[PDB]
Amino acid sequence: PPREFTQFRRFYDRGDLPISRNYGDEQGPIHWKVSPDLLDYHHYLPVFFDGLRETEEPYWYFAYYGTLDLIAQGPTKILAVVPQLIIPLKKDLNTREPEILCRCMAVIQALVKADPLISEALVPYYRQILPVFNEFFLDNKNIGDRIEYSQRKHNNLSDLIHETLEEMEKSGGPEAYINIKYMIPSYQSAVA
């Protein structure tokens, strides 16, 4: 599977906002040209989701942190765009590189926390998403009694799977667990 061409690069070359990285202010990693509240959510956010697949700067830095800021500031409006995010999200997971999936899981964890209704709307989309997780589930390494460094890269992909799956299980509701079983045989419920 070649690198399917990312729309975010085509939106960024002419119109995208997050270029601003300049501060004389008490602000975070990225800045916006305009306040995100005025922006629409059908055009910007799906493009941002597609940008996590970028591998070289400045595209991926803006796309990753832009997605985080948009999901944090505007959690009410994202419910409408939830169906449109499945396609670009499914593009990112199929890359299977041990770096993109870390970003995707961070976004997903930041996504389910926004609204229990959102996670209930993601139950039909589990089948479209989980097969990547169902592959990488058991990639941990045995070291015995001595030390793990990987977590400062935050790249121990298995541990990200466990917490993230626990997050959909809590917010998924009544029918999230049975769907997880249909995708993940080795999973066992953490409901209580």
């Binding site: 202010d25 977590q151 400062r152 935050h154």
Partner: protein, 427 residues
Amino acid sequence: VREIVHIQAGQCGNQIGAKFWEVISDEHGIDPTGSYHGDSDLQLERINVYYNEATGGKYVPRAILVDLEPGTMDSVRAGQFGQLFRPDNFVFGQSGAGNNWAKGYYTEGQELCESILDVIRKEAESCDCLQGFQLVHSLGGGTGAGLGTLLLNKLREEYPDRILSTYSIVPSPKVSDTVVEPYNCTLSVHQLVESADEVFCIDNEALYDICFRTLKLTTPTYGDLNHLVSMVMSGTTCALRFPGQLNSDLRKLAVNLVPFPRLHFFIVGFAPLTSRGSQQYRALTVPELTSQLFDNKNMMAACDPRRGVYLTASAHFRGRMSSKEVDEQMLNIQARNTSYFVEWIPSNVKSAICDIPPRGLKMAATFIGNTTAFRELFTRVDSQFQKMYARRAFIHWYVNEGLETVEFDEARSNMTDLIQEYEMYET
């Protein structure tokens, strides 16, 4: 039974730590890729202190490298022992500082924290006995000083009992490399005083001065200076790994040297040091070690103890020697210079011996002392800071970060209080 996790911020600090691992691996006989090929069974008595074993007979060191721009990490990977470090051991930011202390601490520090803490975290519950981390950083810069002070607070919060042993390089007062430095050092001192259990001060001016008094290196480079710092670090942590006849650890040295919680800044020194050609003439003995250790031309700190008085002192020895000879020296040099010992804190000098000396240097010693002469150091940076602060042009650089103007004054007030505390304690 004593495992230490070593943390390196600083462009300066990362290079120093890499040379330290060069010294340790040569001492232990470790391949720069981690495979044991040494010659002494005593090298594996306590190798777990600094190393991990990966399945495959490879040893990985307890080393954390901290930076904010990938240039230094790229240099470290180009180093000899770059493969020794586990590839995940390195982290680097994505928005540089340019020695701006406020920028690194406030904006870059918060983002860096959630990532950096967790090797400090997962080393702790898996380093087989945590009784102290170790941090090497620079005070004049912005990346090491600001981030190191911030992480020192989080280290104290998450790990209260574990000893936060810190080694810092003081701003050179005649000339140092950076000049945002007086602002940076002032703000870092307030953070360092309260949290760090032990702070050790090193000046590059003294290192160059020592090189030309003793080494007669006509043309030294950074490699020699960091090598001497590595020698001090090897001498400090040698007692934990190797046998001897009388040994003191970090917590013992804190007990033996620190009389009061805020009077714990120490000077460091190493002996013997000799020029590459005149070493044949010299007959290295215990009195030669004692004279070299206490001679002012060998102190690696830009503070003459003769301008002050001594509170507590410590001496360590590497190799096989008679204890009677060592303690014979410790009485007679304690009596010789009674004008430098405080009357109401006797027993300033302490002694220790470790069995295994480093390679080639049959007999070795490391000296750590406490003297009121520290007051000169804070006075110099305060004097330089005063007229710099008197025209607030530079703080607006730090204010735009989010740092309040009043933040500079509380550090200055704490600095003056620390100076006053050392002044009363002289009498």
